Amino acid sequence: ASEQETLVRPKPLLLKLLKSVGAQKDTYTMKEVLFYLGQYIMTKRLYDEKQQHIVYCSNDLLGDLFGVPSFSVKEHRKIYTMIYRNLVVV
């Protein structure tokens, strides 16, 4: 990409989560969304402490938004797919 420059409007749940890490917008690019999702993962400590490239999001809003209990941070296309479903593209 840039496919990452894609303009997007997050749906209410996703928008609430981004604003909780200080996102101050209703419309974003795909790369801004990932930045703030990465920062949410950090503050909630959902990344594997054993450093095995996995986010454990079960029993957390992210888990509910992504429809999985855990994901690899290396599956970039998978992550964008899970993100797009919580978004209206502009």
Ligand SMILES: CC(C)(C)NC(=O)[C@H](c1c(C(=O)O)[nH]c2cc(Cl)ccc12)N(C=O)Cc1ccc(Cl)cc1
């Ligand atoms: C340690 C941890 C889990 C907080 N962060 C990452 O592994 C980030 C990462 C970023 C970042 O802002 O780069 N944003 C993310 C959003 C989600 Cl949901 C999960 C992980 C990341 N990443 C590499 O550095 C992996 C990665 C980068 C781009 C794409 Cl399209 C997909 C994965």
Ligand SMILES: [K+]
């Ligand atoms: K929603």
Ligand SMILES: [K+]
């Ligand atoms: K705008």
